[model samples]
Target: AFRQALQLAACGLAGGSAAVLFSAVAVGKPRAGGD
Candidate 1:
């Protein structure tokens, strides 16, 4: 139970990090002269 929870937590964190990175690449682009 403990190990599974830990694994899930890690997966959640990884997913969240990936989301942030994806947002940066997908929507972080500057418009016009600057962001």
Candidate 2:
């Protein structure tokens, strides 16, 4: 159970990081008016 919880947390962190990075790129591109 502990191992499962740790895995879940790690996955969540990775997902969150990806989301933030994606959002940054998305916003930056549109706002910067770049291709």
Candidate 3:
């Protein structure tokens, strides 16, 4: 159904945003002798 497709897309976008934000926060941490 069209509604289902829209819901799926929204979920995907939200998940992707969360992942990127998580990684950004992780990277923001201070790490010595960087990798």
lDDT for each candidate structure = 0.73, 0.73, 0.72
Candidate 1 TM-score versus the reference: 0.37
Error of 2 at 7 (Å): 0.5
lDDT of 3 by residue, 1-35 (tens): 79799988888787786786578668786356541
- Which residue pairs collide, candidate 1? none
What is the model-wide C-alpha lDDT for candidate 3? 0.72
Q: How far off is residue 22 in model 3, in Å?
A: 11
Instruction: For model 1, state the Cα shift of residue 18 in Å.
Output: 7.8
